[PDB]
Design a protein around this nucleic acid. Structure first.
Ligand SMILES: [Mg+2]
Ligand SMILES: [Mg+2]
Ligand SMILES: [Mg+2]
Ligand SMILES: [Mg+2]
Ligand SMILES: [Mg+2]
Ligand SMILES: [Mg+2]
Ligand SMILES: [Mg+2]
Ligand SMILES: [Mg+2]
Ligand SMILES: [Mg+2]
Ligand SMILES: [Mg+2]
Ligand SMILES: [Mg+2]
Ligand SMILES: [Mg+2]
Ligand SMILES: [Mg+2]
Ligand SMILES: [Mg+2]
Ligand SMILES: [Mg+2]
Ligand SMILES: [Mg+2]
Ligand SMILES: [Mg+2]
Ligand SMILES: [Mg+2]
Ligand SMILES: [Mg+2]
Ligand SMILES: [Mg+2]
Ligand SMILES: [Mg+2]
Ligand SMILES: [Mg+2]
Ligand SMILES: [Mg+2]
Ligand SMILES: [Mg+2]
Ligand SMILES: [Mg+2]
Ligand SMILES: [Mg+2]
Ligand SMILES: [Mg+2]
Ligand SMILES: [Mg+2]
Ligand SMILES: [Mg+2]
Ligand SMILES: [Mg+2]
Ligand SMILES: [Mg+2]
Ligand SMILES: [Mg+2]
Ligand SMILES: [Mg+2]
Ligand SMILES: [Mg+2]
Ligand SMILES: [Mg+2]
Ligand SMILES: [Mg+2]
Ligand SMILES: [Zn+2]
Lengths: 204, 136, 123, 38
RNA sequence: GCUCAACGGAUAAAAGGUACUCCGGGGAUAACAGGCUGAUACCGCCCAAGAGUUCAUAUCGACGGCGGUGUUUGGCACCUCGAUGUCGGCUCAUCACAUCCUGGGGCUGAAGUAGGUCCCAAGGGUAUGGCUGUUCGCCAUUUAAAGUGGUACGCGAGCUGG
RNA sequence: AGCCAGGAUGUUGGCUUAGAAGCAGCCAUCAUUUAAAGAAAGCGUAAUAGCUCACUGGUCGAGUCGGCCUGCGCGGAAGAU
RNA sequence: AAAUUCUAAU
RNA sequence: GCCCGGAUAGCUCAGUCGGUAGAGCAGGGGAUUGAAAAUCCCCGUGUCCUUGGUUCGAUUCCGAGUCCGGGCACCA
């Protein structure tokens, strides 16, 4: 199922500095719960909150059944209390936003397998006198599964053009998959996170 | 892929491949492939044949590789003219003369070694035969 | 005697005024289309609130030609313009519900009896 | 019919017959086993 | 007494452009085409881990191996420098088959209709337009189909000149 | 090689899984009656079934069955006046 | 003679 | 493809002339403030890109390699 390592992200919602203080307290709570489970917690990244805790702390928790237990902590958490950054004794309400993610294999297969490539060789255009006319010094490669087309005619050698055009094809087919993965994870984070505004919450 | 860990010299002449072979007997196992033709074995061919013969005996018994590819073969890049130096090392080969034993195998039935020595020879460019131990 | 690039009028109330022939269907290397032949057209202008929009790609049937038709006794019938009735790509059925001007006897087939019925007169 | 440079027996019903200077394989059980050398 | 190191040392003393060019020679030496070769290119075949619900071979074929052709890019520098006019388009073609359609068959994971793949077969046929000088390619709409190559990558004492 | 006959007994096994029973894949591969018969080589079920082979008896009845070394041939083998 | 700031529930 | 330059602390960067590595920012503790910053005091830095070799000893010297930056790739 899903009993793997997790990424725990918690950031400040409404409140400002007090939200940062509560984020620090909440992260400390989770760190203590993890250390009393024989789990390892590592700070992948930190953005501190001026007075107290963190504007945004993201950590990676490694262990057994981590995601099976921590996957219900997503959403918003509300805190009502007398803040430390308050001259008077006024009670204030603030919120923090928590997301929990799994980890996935990230293989990047260079599908440069030539069994699914269409290659065309043809003449080039420009100033070349009598040699350029009677020679196939321009290359074009199309990758059939994805429909990505790249052509090269910059040099006088067919071999050089083929090599660098193939390299460009590989790079610009890898980018088109990295972007898709990035937008998928960003969307998932967006609908898991919510918008910390002390009205959408899971616990008070 | 077998290859010397370190070598005194980077490149080497071409030479010739005349004469018969020393090491025409089986010394460790009970069966082996003896080479009949003359040529070269690349390290890619030795590993390709060893995997086919290994998979056929179901990881039973012992297998000896009795040749080593310790000769560097150079090759010029593409679409260049002559001369201007010597090419770069690309692969390693082992010269084969008529008579060498290429592999050994022990711990398996006599009829099973033939089957595994049949799939192994199919990956090699040199005609081979099957031999057994001799008392003297 | 209709080729590609030929402009034709329209002889129904489908909302088009001038259409331009872009293909003569029926065979390879086919040259002309006479009365009773299906062609491929594009709309060049249309009524503001018609059934069809300018730039559409449809089919049509030729019902009047300047070159005319010839009859088995040697006689001919000629008009003063080329006209067509708009059909749809799939069902081969007329789009409008009215026909303007006369038609001819070469439409007396089961495919175009919907046009023969609606026409003011048949020549 | 499968045309290949190496015809071989694939089951126990396959037979080797040389007809008109051509070597071919036929078996009475599996029609997929018939083949000729070419 | 010389890094006269271009080391048998030209003067004590010295850099470039020519598409505005010019003379004497060379196929002793390059760019086009021919030639030898076939690394590269394209097409076949051998073995069979395997995928295919099960099942190596209905359809594919990992690791390796063996050949054919002379369409590509090359290697060589054998012919031509007292001259063999070089891309594409037009008109006109002719041959090979490694067959796009039509024709005859075997297997199928072939109910039918439609297909996949492999044999035999060269008689005939085998698009019009938009963009670009374009070969190539993308797109729109047709067709039974819009084949792959050789011929100085056919064809300027047959046309053009982008 | 044909031609008749047989070609048996507790594994509805735990071992895996819903179901795996000789023939899906993990182990073992004993014993009995017998002239023979494998606790399964093949075809065949979701799982059973069902269908062959080995092996063993009768007629026939003279030869028959596969490796090794060698000579010459066969296929693999498609291009352009 | 120098010197910035104090979110959001009274 | 050819030639040239560079790789040193968490980040930008100086330095050897074979025995020994620094600066600014950042980092940790403490002062001042009702509190945060600015200001003050005290304290730590790193297998000098990878590899093989010569050396008693290599960041340094000599061959290979990777990555990064620049110049060149012309006559047909
Ligand atoms: Mg120029
Ligand atoms: Mg339009
Ligand atoms: Mg016949
Ligand atoms: Mg000199
Ligand atoms: Mg000299
Ligand atoms: Mg001028
Ligand atoms: Mg002269
Ligand atoms: Mg010379
Ligand atoms: Mg010279
Ligand atoms: Mg030449
Ligand atoms: Mg010549
Ligand atoms: Mg399988
Ligand atoms: Mg040629
Ligand atoms: Mg050539
Ligand atoms: Mg010459
Ligand atoms: Mg010479
Ligand atoms: Mg001459
Ligand atoms: Mg010349
Ligand atoms: Mg002359
Ligand atoms: Mg002349
Ligand atoms: Mg053929
Ligand atoms: Mg024909
Ligand atoms: Mg005839
Ligand atoms: Mg144009
Ligand atoms: Mg032709
Ligand atoms: Mg050619
Ligand atoms: Mg030409
Ligand atoms: Mg041509
Ligand atoms: Mg001429
Ligand atoms: Mg003339
Ligand atoms: Mg001009
Ligand atoms: Mg002009
Ligand atoms: Mg032969
Ligand atoms: Mg501020
Ligand atoms: Mg305030
Ligand atoms: Mg401090
Ligand atoms: Zn068979």
């Amino acid at each position: 199922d899903d009993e793997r390592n997790a990424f725990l992200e918690v950031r400040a919602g409404t409140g400002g500095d007090e939200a940062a203080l509560f984020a620090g307290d909440l992260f400390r709570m989770y760190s203590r719960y993890a250390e009393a489970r024989r789990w390892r917690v590592e700070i992948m990244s930190a953005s501190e909150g001026e007075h107290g805790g963190y504007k945004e702390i993201i950590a990676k928790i490694s262990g057994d059944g981590v995601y099976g237990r921590l996957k219900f902590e997503s959403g918003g958490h509300r805190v009502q209390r007398v803040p430390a950054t308050e001259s008077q004794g006024r009670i204030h309400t603030s919120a923090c936003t928590v997301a929990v993610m799994p980890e996935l294999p990230d293989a990047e297969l260079p599908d440069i397998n030539p069994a699914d490539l269409r290659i065309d060789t043809f003449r080039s255009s420009g100033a070349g006198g009598q040699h350029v006319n009677t020679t196939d010094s321009a290359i074009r490669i199309t990758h059939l599964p994805t429909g990505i087309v790249v052509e090269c005619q910059d040099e006088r050698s067919q071999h050089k053009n083929k090599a660098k055009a193939l390299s460009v094809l590989g790079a610009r087919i890898h980018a088109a998959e990295m972007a898709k993965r990035q937008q998928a994870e960003a969307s998932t984070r967006r609908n898991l996170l919510g918008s910390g505004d002390r009205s959408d919450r899971n616990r008070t | 892929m077998l290859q010397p860990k370190r070598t005194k010299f980077r490149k080497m002449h071409k030479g010739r491949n005349r004469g018969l072979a020393q090491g025409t007997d089986v010394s460790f196992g009970s069966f082996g492939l003896k080479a009949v033709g003359r040529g070269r074995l690349t390290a890619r061919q030795i590993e390709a044949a060893r995997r086919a013969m290994t998979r056929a005996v179901k990881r039973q018994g012992k297998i000896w590789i009795r040749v080593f590819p310790d000769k560097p073969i150079t090759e010029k890049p593409l679409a260049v003219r002559m001369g201007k130096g010597k090419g770069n090392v690309e692969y390693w080969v082992a010269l084969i003369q008529p008579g060498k034993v290429l592999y050994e195998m022990d711990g398996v039935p006599e009829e099973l070694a033939r089957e595994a020595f049949k799939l192994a020879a199919a990956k090699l460019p040199i005609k081979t035969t099957f031999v057994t131990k001799t008392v003297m | 005697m209709i080729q590609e690039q030929t402009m034709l009028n329209v002889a129904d109330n489908s909302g088009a005024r001038r259409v331009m022939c872009i293909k003569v269907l029926g065979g390879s290397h086919r040259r002309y289309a006479g009365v009773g032949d299906i062609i491929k057209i594009t709309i060049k202008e249309a009524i503001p609130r018609g059934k069809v929009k300018k730039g559409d790609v449809l089919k049509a049937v030729v019902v009047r030609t300047k070159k005319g038709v010839r009859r088995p006794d040697g006689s001919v019938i000629r008009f003063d313009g080329n006209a067509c009735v708009l059909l749809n790509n799939n069902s081969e059925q007329p789009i409008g519900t009215r026909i303007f001007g006369p038609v001819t006897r070469e439409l007396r087939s089961e495919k175009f009896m919907k046009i023969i019925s609606l026409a003011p007169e048949v020549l | 019919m499968k045309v290949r440079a190496s015809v071989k027996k694939l089951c126990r019903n396959c037979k080797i017959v040389k007809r008109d200077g051509v070597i071919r394989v036929i078996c009475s059980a599996e029609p997929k086993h018939k083949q000729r050398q070419g």
